[PDB]
Amino acid sequence: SVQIVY
Amino acid sequence: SVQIVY
Amino acid sequence: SVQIVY
Amino acid sequence: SVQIVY
Amino acid sequence: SVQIVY
Amino acid sequence: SVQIVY
Amino acid sequence: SVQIVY
Amino acid sequence: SVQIVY
Amino acid sequence: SVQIVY
Amino acid sequence: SVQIVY
């Protein structure tokens, strides 16, 4: 997965 | 999955 | 899935 | 699924 | 499904 | 899929 | 699918 | 998939 | 996938 | 995948 959190 | 949170 | 939260 | 929340 | 919430 | 938004 | 919005 | 947003 | 955002 | 954001 690609998991991005800002 | 692609999981993005702002 | 693509899961996006703003 | 595509799950988007604003 | 496509699930979008504003 | 399940989407729950508060 | 299930979508619940409050 | 499951998406829960508070 | 699971996405939980507070 | 699991993504949890506080």
From Swiss-Prot, chains A, B, C, D, E, F, G, H, I, J:
Subcellular location: Cytoplasm, Cytosol; Cell membrane; Cytoplasm, Cytoskeleton; Cell projection, Axon
Phosphoserine: residues carrying this PTM: S1
Signal peptide: none
Tissue specificity remark: Expressed in neurons. Isoform PNS-tau is expressed in the peripheral nervous system while the others are expressed in the central nervous system.
Domain of life: Eukaryota
Coiled-coil regions listed in the entry: none
Post-translational modifications reported in the UniProt record: Phosphorylation at serine and threonine residues in S-P or T-P motifs by proline-directed protein kinases (PDPK1, CDK1, CDK5, GSK3, MAPK) (only 2-3 sites per protein in interphase, seven-fold increase in mitosis, and in the form associated with paired helical filaments (PHF-tau)), and at serine residues in K-X-G-S motifs by MAP/microtubule affinity-regulating kinase (MARK1, MARK2, MARK3 or MARK4), causing detachment from microtubules, and their disassembly. Phosphorylation decreases with age.
UniProt subunit comment: Interacts with MARK1, MARK2, MARK3 and MARK4. Interacts with PSMC2 through SQSTM1. Interacts with SQSTM1 when polyubiquitinated. Interacts with FKBP4. Binds to CSNK1D. Interacts with SGK1. Interacts with PIN1. Interacts with LRRK2. Interacts with LRP1, leading to endocytosis; this interaction is reduced in the presence of LRPAP1/RAP.
Domain notes: The tau/MAP repeat binds to tubulin. Type I isoforms contain 3 repeats while type II isoforms contain 4 repeats.
Disease linked to the protein: In Alzheimer disease, the neuronal cytoskeleton in the brain is progressively disrupted and replaced by tangles of paired helical filaments (PHF) and straight filaments, mainly composed of hyperphosphorylated forms of TAU (PHF-TAU or AD P-TAU). O-GlcNAcylation is greatly reduced in Alzheimer disease brain cerebral cortex leading to an increase in TAU/MAPT phosphorylations.
Function: Promotes microtubule assembly and stability, and might be involved in the establishment and maintenance of neuronal polarity. The C-terminus binds axonal microtubules while the N-terminus binds neural plasma membrane components, suggesting that tau functions as a linker protein between both. Axonal polarity is predetermined by TAU/MAPT localization (in the neuronal cell) in the domain of the cell body defined by the centrosome. The short isoforms allow plasticity of the cytoskeleton whereas the longer isoforms may preferentially play a role in its stabilization.
Protein name per UniProt: Microtubule-associated protein tau
UniProt gene name: MAPT
Interval of the full protein contained in this chain: 622 to 627 of 758
